[PDB]
């Protein structure tokens, strides 16, 4: 036929891509960072515990001031917390209790959330009525909302389980751009520090790098066996880490277009729910289904610490923009601030 | 007592928020949450017709001092294992199966009949790790159409291992036993089975009778016995 000739053309292009990226692999990152002196044992102790949620916390997002954080749980509430004093600043009752994601705007005026109702609702925090209001609701996905991330007060990238990411204009309510190309449910999303790129990992063991202005897929990253649940950019904007269900974190470089490091252990057999980097990018913190978090030395692939405070699965984590603390939320209804 | 005036008023605001959160969690804790599963054309829609009269569809009904919330998740065409843990801790799972889909082959592909598809879905959610202890109310729907269709098209179309009568009650009891035989661990969870048509008006009484046992078990867990 002709479509089989086109798929032989696609297989020729795929092994050309693989040979051109194995031509770049001259030395691994474990050879470059061999004589780098190790991190040592990272002993982070839990400093606060945020106790107001009554169900499983599915997401959390730090504000840009590194003090306020929002957390969404499936009792239909999202609480904004003051992490310094453990105070509750607001508690927003959600219209659908089945939240999977929550986002904080970098201005601090908006929070977004969404989930199994396929809508990223957007909540105005800075109202002169004194109560939080639903400013906009963004329908247009045909699968569940799995990640929302703000760029401005007027733009938000939402990833979803209809194999599609989308860029939204908030004040009109319409999708500006649709990002298609994944063949499984897009589970995670991480914007670049310049917010001109974002990576999105899906359930087809793939991570794709998207240009927000052009609307296209620039690079596609493989290496995982199972569904990528977590994705997080490096602070340089030149690499990212993906966590997946095959009990493995992997670091992928953008300008090299392949995988640099893999963070595995033979005791680790459960999937990875959340990843984030520290402020330097030296530590890769990863949350697990074995109820604890592991601190990975991201340059040497050595386990540098265990954050072992939770009684159920760590579903969400975030490092502050200060670099000062890690928040880890979990299915046991608690947020813990670690330092 | 080393707080400011505004820090003390923020602590008072956070305690009022905690009071409203505690009261809303108490109001949500006395509500019966029901997953509604089943394949297509299995009579889920006539059951949502029977109880009260994009995304997840929520249905509320109150029946004899008990507020129910029924979640239909048939709309989301996604990989189910990425969100099925959201309904961990649901009170029961209502599973609708059309009895008349024993001979009806699936329109997705004609190698799979619809009763084997629903048996695969029941084996998937029955032996889930999130529903190890969750009671399952299995509704076997459209028994009048099954009564008309078992007269001439036998159950050897669907179950070729079956040897029995070509009447309603022997074939229906075989289908119910074939569904109830699908739990790998038959000790932790309870499966309830009820035959349904469009004319029945006691299926909500069957559902209330089945969730009274889950309420008794959770009351014993609240009172420290487990």
């Amino acid at each position, epitope marked *: 036929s002709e479509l089989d000739q086109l798929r032989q053309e696609a297989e020729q292009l795929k092994n050309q891509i693989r040979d051109a990226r194995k031509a770049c692999a001259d030395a691994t990152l474990s050879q470059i960072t061999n004589n780098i002196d190790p991190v040592g044992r990272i002993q982070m102790r839990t400093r606060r515990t945020l106790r107001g949620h009554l169900a499983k916390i599915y997401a959390m997002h730090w504000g840009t001031d590194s003090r306020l954080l929002v957390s969404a749980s499936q009792d239909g509430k999202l609480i904004i917390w003051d992490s310094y004093t453990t105070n509750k600043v*607001h508690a927003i009752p959600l219209r659908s209790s089945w939240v999977m994601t929550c986002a904080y705007a970098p201005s601090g005026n908006y929070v977004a959330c969404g989930g199994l109702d396929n809508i990223c609702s957007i909540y105005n925090l800075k109202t*002169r009525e*004194g*109560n939080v209001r639903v400013s906009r609701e963004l329908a247009g996905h045909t699968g569940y909302l799995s990640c929302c991330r703000f760029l401005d007060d007027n733009q938000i990238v939402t990833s979803s389980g209809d194999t599609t990411c989308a860029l939204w204009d908030i004040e009109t309510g319409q999708q500006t751009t649709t990002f298609t190309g994944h063949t499984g449910d897009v589970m995670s999303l991480s914007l670049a520090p310049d917010t001109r790129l974002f990576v999105s990992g899906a359930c087809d063991a793939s991570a794709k790098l998207w240009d927000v202005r052009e609307g296209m897929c620039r690079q596609t990253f493989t290496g995982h066996e199972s569904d990528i649940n977590a994705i997080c950019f490096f602070p340089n904007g030149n690499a990212f880490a993906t966590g997946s269900d095959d009990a493995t974190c992997r670091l992928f470089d953008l300008r090299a277009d392949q995988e640099l490091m893999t963070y595995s252990h033979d005791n680790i057999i459960c999937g990875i729910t959340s990843v984030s980097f520290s402020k330097s990018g030296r530590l890769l913190l990863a949350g697990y289904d074995d109820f604890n978090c592991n601190v990975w030395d991201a340059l040497k692939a050595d386990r540098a610490g265990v954050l072992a405070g939770h009684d159920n699965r760590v579903s969400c984590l975030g490092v502050t923009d200060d670099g000062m603390a890690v928040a880890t939320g979990s299915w046991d209804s608690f947020l813990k601030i670690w330092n | 007592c080393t707080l400011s005036a*505004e820090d003390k*008023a923020a602590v*008072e605001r956070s305690k009022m928020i905690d009071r409203n959160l505690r009261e809303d969690g108490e109001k949500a804790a006395r509500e019966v949450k029901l997953l509604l599963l089943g394949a297509g054309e299995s009579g889920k829609s006539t059951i949502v017709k029977q109880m009260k009269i994009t995304g997840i569809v929520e249905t509320h009904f109150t029946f004899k001092d008990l507020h129910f919330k029924m979640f239909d998740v048939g709309g989301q065409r996604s990989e189910r294992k990425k969100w099925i843990h959201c309904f961990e801790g649901v009170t029961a799972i209502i599973f609708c199966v059309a009895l008349s889909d024993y001979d009806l082959v699936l329109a997705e592909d004609e190698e799979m009949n619809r009763m084997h598809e629903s048996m695969k879905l029941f084996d998937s959610i029955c032996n889930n790790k999130w529903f190890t202890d969750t009671s399952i109310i299995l509704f076997l729907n459209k028994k009048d159409l099954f009564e008309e269709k078992i007269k001439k098209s036998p159950l050897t179309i669907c179950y070729p291992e079956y040897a029995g009568s070509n009447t309603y009650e022997e074939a229906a009891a075989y289908i119910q036993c074939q569904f109830e035989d699908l739990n790998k661990r038959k000790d932790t969870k309870e499966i309830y089975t009820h035959f349904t048509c469009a004319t029945d008006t006691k299926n909500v009484q069957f559902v209330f009778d089945a969730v009274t046992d889950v309420i008794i078990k959770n009351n014993l867990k609240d009172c420290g016995l487990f």
Partner: single-chain antibody, 233 residues
Framework: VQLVESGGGLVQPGGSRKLSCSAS????????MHWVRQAPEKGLEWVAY????????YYADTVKGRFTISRDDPKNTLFLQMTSLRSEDTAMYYC??????????????WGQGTTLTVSGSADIVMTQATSSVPVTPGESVSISCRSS???????????LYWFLQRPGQSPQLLIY???NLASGVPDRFSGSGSGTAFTLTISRLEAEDVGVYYC?????????FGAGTKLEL
């Protein structure tokens, strides 16, 4: 957002009056409420406070025992039951809404005020040393306030609030917590200071900035204002 104070008028001395302020257009139950009076050409004087949820009530010691502040949260109405009314209680009484969380704007909306005409060394003294600055438009004007105590707290906030009362109007908040600009306020206004010495810089003054300017501390109850600094064209 609107607050209409009602009551007041000719009250015999020793008598009684209930002031009432109906609130419309905002989530009234989450705001703490204040009464702030103003003697017929004196400065602002804080009277009472009720919390959100009514769980914390303060009074000035000038009115303690004689005044009772109470809110009715379904009817959206704040009351000040005033007994034993003296000739010093002749004032114009403002309702002020004030919400308190991390990063909130207290004292941000003031009511129009009703006129009642009846016919404390531990308090932080806010001293506005200048009382009148005559100024032509276009100029950059600084207004200085001085505090008896260091308004800087150990959490890092210095609780100093700036208000402007235009002629024939309610005071409106210009600056909260010594530097943060209020909503609906131009960036002409700026605030600075260490503990005990504070500045309000009106850069490039327009004709709408004419009025009396008040500092206020919110570090400790009772809340105390400055005497006020008049600006004239």
């Amino acid at each position: 957002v609107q607050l209409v104070e009602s009551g007041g008028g000719l009250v015999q001395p020793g008598g009684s009056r209930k002031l009432s302020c109906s609130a419309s257009g905002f989530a009234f139950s989450s705001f703490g409420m204040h009464w702030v009076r103003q003697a017929p050409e004196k400065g602002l004087e804080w009277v009472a406070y009720i919390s959100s949820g009514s769980g914390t009530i303060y009074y000035a010691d000038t009115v303690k025992g004689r005044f009772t502040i109470s809110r009715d949260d379904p009817k959206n109405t704040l009351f000040l039951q005033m007994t034993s009314l003296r000739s010093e209680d002749t004032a114009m009484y403002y309702c002020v809404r004030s919400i308190y969380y991390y990063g909130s704007s207290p004292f941000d909306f003031w009511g129009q005020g009703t006129t009642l005409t009846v016919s404390g060394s531990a308090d932080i003294v806010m001293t506005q040393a200048t009382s009148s600055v005559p100024v032509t438009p276009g100029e950059s004007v600084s207004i200085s306030c001085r505090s008896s105590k260091s308004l800087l707290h150990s959490n890092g906030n210095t609780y100093l609030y700036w208000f402007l009362q235009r002629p024939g109007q309610s005071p409106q908040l210009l600056i909260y917590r010594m530097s943060n600009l209020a909503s609906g306020v131009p960036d002409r206004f700026s605030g600075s200071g260490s503990g005990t010495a504070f500045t309000l810089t009106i850069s490039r003054l327009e004709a709408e900035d004419v009025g009396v300017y008040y500092c206020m501390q919110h570090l400790e109850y009772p809340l105390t204002f400055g005497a006020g600094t008049k600006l004239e064209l």
